[PDB]
Symmetry: D3
Subunit: 151 residues, 6 copies
């Protein structure tokens, strides 16, 4: 009866994201990854799906419009997202307060695992496009598609 939505662009999903999914899935009856660029929509979904097969209570959905409308429509009960820094917290803070104001929807933040603290979709992509190896920071389903898109 509890449910969390983990929203993001996931372009592509990273091992930091999967860590958040696993931790959300352990505390909520259901988790919905809402995908809201380098990869098109279908690629993003497949990469998330392929990376979370070990999470039976998690489902992946494409989202549109406000996250809070997605949460309330799904009958979900909260938003969960990962935080790395105090500056992450301050921007996500404003968004969470706003979401609470407009829809009554709450947001729970989880601290990133230390080993993924410096990993983001954006930085991974910029490094990859310049010839660096980020394969230890991404799930293999992403690594596969990444190599192909840069081959």
């Amino acid at each position: 009866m509890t449910g969390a939505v983990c929203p993001g662009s996931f372009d592509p999903v990273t091992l930091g994201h999967v860590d958040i999914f696993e931790r959300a899935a352990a505390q909520f009856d259901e988790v919905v990854v809402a995908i809201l660029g380098m990869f098109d929509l279908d690629e993003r979904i497949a990469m998330v799906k392929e990376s979370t097969t070990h999470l039976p209570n998690l489902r992946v959905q494409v989202g549109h419009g406000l996250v809070v409308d997605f949460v309330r429509s799904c009958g979900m009960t909260a938003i969960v997202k990962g935080l790395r820094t105090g500056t992450d917290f301050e921007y996500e803070l404003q968004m969470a307060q706003m979401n609470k104001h407009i829809a009554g929807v709450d947001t729970f933040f989880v601290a990133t695992a230390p080993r993924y603290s410096f990993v983001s979709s954006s930085l991974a992509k910029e490094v990859a496009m310049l010839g660096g190896d980020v394969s230890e920071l991404l799930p293999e389903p992403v690594n596969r598609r990444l190599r192909d898109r840069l081959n």
Copy 2:
């Protein structure tokens, strides 16, 4: 089957704390407030209890030793605490990472309601001891005991 522990000294509990309790209680099957100074242990418990009677799935317990041992002993599944600022986040971040490392216990943070952003037990107490009125920032059960302790 889900359970969150909200730990703190609660000396005294504030309306910011109660806001966190209510939001935890809405997402978890059970919430345990763990009380770990101006008020003695018994006063703190009573004040928390008196302020949370509208929360049927919440219980108040005195705690001792590491929070993570309390969580695992209670068969609880997570720690929940409130955050006001980016500097709060960085100190609580270190603690959460440490707790995750030593016990595998996860921590979910919730952004304070905007109207309670500047309220803390410490600041409330210092202002109260100097003759200021913080009654709109504390539950009435606390206000009652506070007036008595300063009368």
Copy 3:
């Protein structure tokens, strides 16, 4: 003989902005709101004017070029702006130091009211464009024009 300039794009002005105007107007003989996008220039001015009729010592002006040149030309004596977060402070800090260096013009910062901490023109607009209700965060003169522009 004292005068503060409150500069910004005010696109649109928010209740957080009006709170700053009121607090500036209480401490300075004169306040000049300098307007420096969703709404054109004329709309922005009218919205500010319509929202500050209760402030007799405040005037609204369109500005061009550096804020400090506007301040010195108006014979004003300081810049006043609102701050919500430590990350706001660091960017505005650099600007204030720069303005002090180049023109000798000082900047006074005021902490946002807690209830408007998460409100900004940008976030209000993004939420509004996606169908969310931000009417409690904006003056009615803005709400009127906003509904019209989204109707």
Copy 4:
């Protein structure tokens, strides 16, 4: 008719503090330095007085109890203080919001001059006690008393 209180322990006053006093005195009809340890009360007052003789609209007073009660009793209209960092801002933010809540008293912050950014009474004292020369960071009236107290 405008008036600012600049409160602090001023133990001892630094050139960063005097910079704030000068900037407050330029924008307000009156400035009251409220002194609220290494130096006793009388030394602190004299050092502030001796360092601000070039500020005719500034007076120095010993304060007791809440700053906001001092402000309202003096018929003053605002608190002014200096800020160096984003972490300064977050602690002073909580205090300013609290002061606004309890007494309606507003706080204006001013960014430190870059050359005094790293100067505080505490750090100056610790360095001085260990044999370092901080004379370029303090007014001469303080330097005089400091040498004597360490001779």
Copy 5:
């Protein structure tokens, strides 16, 4: 046998940048300024060169691709860059951790001199384009080219 690379766009180089170069050159056998817009490549190089003639162990090079590949190719041993704020630190932190992960290359940060804390290439340019005088914040070789480009 020690060597530091100081990378950046240097568009244009500022006195804050030169301060970093001087401090790097004092601790490392060799310093390589790697230039990676208002000024074209050739102008940027000349401005850096013209501003560092007093630094015999420093050389200026145009760079391409990842900074860490430049470092390893030059047989250099570290990256050095200046930091002004805690928010600078958090973004540069992520980059440094990433660079360490992908290439084993370390990054040493140096705190800006207080008098250049508010100076950046970007802010200097925006102020200059609007008619402000930033000549005390830039080397004369830059000031010369700047006046010409705005004349």
Copy 6:
């Protein structure tokens, strides 16, 4: 001819500290660990020594008085320390600027390895005293003495 001092209380030294020592030793001809409580002086030295035998150009010394006097007396050329967060940076920033002002001594900061980001002597000790296992966060020479001191 280059030399860095890594100062601290090292009570006890952690694997985060050793990571900093190794990275300093790779860039400087010589590294001096300056030890400036749970463990007495002799224990601290031995623990540092025992944990750095793989670093031939590093020596351990007890220090007294200002770090900058130690640096200049040793004919060393810089201070090196580790940073974990933006709030670490702001406090260490003030100290570095002060040290630069009083002695001309520069400070180079290094970002902690991600896996040791949450580790500090203080937090390790508090967790250890409460029965938690921090052995993966400390060198074995420290773990040995720690077990003994808690047995």
